[PDB]
Design a protein around this ligand. Structure first.
Ligand code: J2E
Ligand code: MG
Ligand code: ZN
Length: 330
């Protein structure tokens, strides 16, 4: 023909939800033959007209996206291509918030989306502390400093050098240096060791926020523009408890599989078992409530303040999910 297969048609219909919080991302993964990152990135690039704006050849974009997706580990339950696709799509929705309308440049939008796509690539499904404590090659290469996040960046960039993978081949050197610095600043900010300082800075910005042209955020220096993008992708990375419960519970099952497997590797090696990694001493419900109360709600309450009232429904879903997990603490 020159028309979609029936499986491609069902995928195209699910992808009509790409602009919505609560996309059926697991169904997209199944329908695309485990290509959720490639199909969601391609959809977003076409929707935001990024191929025309950045003169990206479409065969190059698809080759890079398949290569990138292939470097996510299919044997890792959480930190895989489905999580990458979810953070991309969640960033895409946050960038579209009315409070940020016409704030960011096309290059900043490309930086936030590309950062989201690469931000966990080649994740081995164990923590930075695990890699440091095992004397792993990755921890030695990065001198024990944001080990995974340094690695995700290095892999995401190095894959541009594979055959027909250089999606930035038509950008000027000035565009490429600006894009590269923003992408590095965003992915390094996904290290949970940076969370308390990012949140402190987001609160300072909400406290002294200016809303110029009568409605929309004023961000007039790199420090403030990159802090908003860093917090936005960090919000997307920590968005699972803000999603409809059927999605949240799938993410909880996956992160607990990954954590319990790390705890099994710690226990078999006689290491201290990391927080929430002991399947024999586990309180999944209590852990989700503590995670929401100490990390996710303080972040999303502050984001919701920055973009008030755009994120009210997201904060309400988070609060409903928190009450649901509390109510099932045995
Ligand atoms: C759906 O539940 C979760 C989704 C993502 C996370 C994460 N947050 N973190 C931090 C790390 C610092 C030490 C403490 C862990 C939190 C991460 O490193 C990742 C990205 C894996 C956590 C999620 O929930 C887990 C299971 C129970 C509560 C934390
Ligand atoms: Mg990460
Ligand atoms: Zn992540």
């Amino acid at each position: 023909f020159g028309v979609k297969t029936e499986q491609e048609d069902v995928l195209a219909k699910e992808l009509e939800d790409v602009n919505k919080w609560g996309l059926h991302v697991f169904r997209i993964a199944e329908l695309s033959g485990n290509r959720p990152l490639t199909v969601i990135m391609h959809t977003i690039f076409q929707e935001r007209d990024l191929l025309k704006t950045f003169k990206i050849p479409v065969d190059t974009l698809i080759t890079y996206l398949m290569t990138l997706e292939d470097h996510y580990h299919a044997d890792v339950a959480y930190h895989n291509n489905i999580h990458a696709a979810d953070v991309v799509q969640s960033t895409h929705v946050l960038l579209s918030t009315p409070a940020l309308e016409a704030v960011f440049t096309d290059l900043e939008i490309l930086a936030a989306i590309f950062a989201s796509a690469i931000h966990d690539v080649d994740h081995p499904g164990v923590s930075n502390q695990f890699l440091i404590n095992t004397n792993s090659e990755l921890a030695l290469m990065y001198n024990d400093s944001s080990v995974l996040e340094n690695h995700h960046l290095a892999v995401g960039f190095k894959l541009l050098q594979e055959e027909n993978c250089d999606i930035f081949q038509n950008l000027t050197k000035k565009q490429r240096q600006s894009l590269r610095k923003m992408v590095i600043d965003i992915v390094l900010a996904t290290d949970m060791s940076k969370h308390m300082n990012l949140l402190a800075d987001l609160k300072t910005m909400v406290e002294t926020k200016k809303v110029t042209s009568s409605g929309v955020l004023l961000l007039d220096n790199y420090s403030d523009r990159i802090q908003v993008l860093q917090n936005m992708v960090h919000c997307a990375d920590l968005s699972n408890p803000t999603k409809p419960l059927q999605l949240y519970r799938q993410w909880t099952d996956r992160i607990m599989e990954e954590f319990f497997r790390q705890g099994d590797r710690e226990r078999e090696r006689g290491m201290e078992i990391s927080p929430m990694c002991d399947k024999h001493n586990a309180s999944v419900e209590k852990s989700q409530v503590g995670f929401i109360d100490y990390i996710v709600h303080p972040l999303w309450e502050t984001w919701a303040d920055l973009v008030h009232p755009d994120a009210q429904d997201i904060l309400d879903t988070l609060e409903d999910n928190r009450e649901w997990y509390q109510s099932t603490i045995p």
